[PDB]
């Protein structure tokens, strides 16, 4: 907004692992304020993922996230007659969010049956460095690279 | 229709109610109707008498009317002759035992409703509306109103294009809830049409 920047609201860490990031992810996943179901789904995803990759539940998730975080995104300035997409260094708070969102989107897209399962699959893909979220990230990066002349 | 009614917004705080009784959902509508009737009757009767506020108050299947008027002498007539007469008719209207009290209005220039009525009367008898308005404002000021506003509207001087004109003097705070703003209205049924007269009289602020 114009007038005043405001302090981001307080977020509680999830009961299972005691993590803020996890909680955020769960929130993102959630729909129609049905938090509980969403959190259950998330947990399920984690468990399966853990089983698959070993490690811990949280650590694996973190790793997955890491492979889909964008260093740089673009924005539309459009000062000229035609529009110029300009790259911008995307901040720590935002980058984490974006990756999560992308993952969620991928999960939603995916052709597997249960939501949780789909999510798990997505996570696995991210970890391995294939899939939808990763592709999206690449695209984002690619665009930035293309428009690197603007800065 | 911008403005809130100045009496209506203040009923909980500085202004009181006119009809002052309790009734259950059963008898409430009927009571209201009765009140409307009696009030209407009173207005019809005591037009020549300068009457400001009829306050109805019914306890224990018996109606207590309180007529605020500038000149009791005309409303009372001979001592307990006219009042008595009024009473039985009131009772009839209600269908219960009636009791009429008559409060004497000190300073009828500061009572808003009365002023409005006067203005209307003046309009009816073909005076210059503006001069009447001025008189209304001036008089109130003289009497010790912290402020007064009056407004008149429509077919002023029998003109084809209707308009509103208004005179304020002193201060008349309407947004301030604690301000004693005596508001009231009237209508001059002239040869060219109706001329509505509003008047706000600010007595002062109440501290509690």
């Amino acid at each position: 907004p114009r007038r005043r920047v405001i302090g981001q609201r307080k977020i509680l860490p999830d009961p299972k692992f005691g993590s803020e990031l996890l909680a955020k992810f769960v929130n993102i996943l959630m729909v129609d304020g049905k938090k509980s179901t969403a959190e259950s789904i998330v947990y399920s995803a984690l468990e399966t993922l853990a089983q698959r990759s070993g490690k811990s539940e949280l650590e694996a998730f973190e790793v997955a996230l890491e492979n889909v975080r964008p260093t740089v995104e673009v924005k539309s300035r459009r000062v000229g007659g035609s529009t110029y997409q300009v790259p911008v260094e995307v901040r720590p708070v935002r980058r984490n969010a974006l990756a999560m969102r992308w993952i969620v989107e991928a999960a939603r897209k995916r052709g597997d049956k249960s939501m949780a399962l789909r999510l798990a699959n997505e996570l696995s893909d991210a970890a391995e460095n294939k899939g939808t979220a990763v592709k999206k990230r690449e695209d984002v990066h690619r665009m930035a690279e293309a428009n690197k002349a603007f800065a | 229709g911008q403005k809130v009614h100045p009496n209506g917004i203040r009923l909980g705080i500085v202004k009181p109610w006119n009809s002052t009784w309790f009734a259950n959902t059963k008898e409430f509508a009927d009571n209201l109707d009765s009140d409307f009737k009696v009030r209407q009757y009173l207005t019809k009767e005591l037009a020549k008498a300068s009457v400001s506020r009829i306050v109805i108050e019914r306890p224990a299947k018996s109606i207590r009317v309180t007529i605020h008027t500038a000149r009791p002498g005309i409303v009372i007539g001979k001592k307990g002759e006219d009042v008595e007469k009024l009473r039985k008719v009131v009772a009839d209207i209600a269908g219960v035992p009636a009791q009429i009290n008559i409060a004497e209005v000190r300073k009828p220039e500061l009572d808003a409703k009365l002023v409005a009525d006067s203005i209307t009367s003046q309009l009816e008898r073909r005076v210059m509306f503006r001069r009447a308005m001025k008189r209304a404002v001036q008089n109130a000021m003289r009497l010790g109103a912290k402020g007064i506003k009056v407004e008149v509207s429509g077919r002023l001087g029998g003109a084809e294009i209707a308009r509103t004109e208004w005179y304020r003097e002193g201060r008349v705070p309407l947004h301030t809830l604690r301000a004693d703003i005596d508001y009231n209205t009237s209508e001059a049924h002239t040869t060219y049409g109706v001329i509505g007269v509003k008047v706000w009289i600010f007595k002062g602020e109440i501290l509690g």
Partner: protein, 100 residues
């Protein structure tokens, strides 16, 4: 509303007042499962015979001042517009603008 409409309403009310005992009885008879068929039939026919304005489902609640059919309130017996006016004037006891 018109005068005529008001008059009609009044008439209807009067009719209702008149024929209540009979009509109610008839209704009861019609309902009563422990009763003769012929009797029931008679009752049904009897009801038809009675005037239509005798029914309470015929009469419309109008404003007691203006006779306006719509925007009515039961507690006050007045149409919204008149009710508001009353409130403003102080004429409805206890009623004031509500905020929460």
């Amino acid at each position: 509303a018109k005068q005529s409409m008001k008059a009609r309403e009044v008439k209807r009310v009067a009719l209702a007042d008149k024929y209540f005992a009979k009509r109610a009885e008839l209704k009861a008879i019609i309902s009563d499962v422990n009763a003769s068929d012929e009797d029931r039939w008679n009752a049904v026919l009897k009801l038809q015979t009675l005037p239509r304005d005798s029914s309470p489902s015929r009469q419309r609640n109008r404003c007691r001042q203006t006779g306006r059919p719509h925007g009515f309130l039961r507690k006050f017996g007045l149409s919204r517009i008149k009710v508001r006016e009353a409130a403003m004037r102080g004429e409805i006891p206890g009623l004031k603008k509500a905020s929460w």
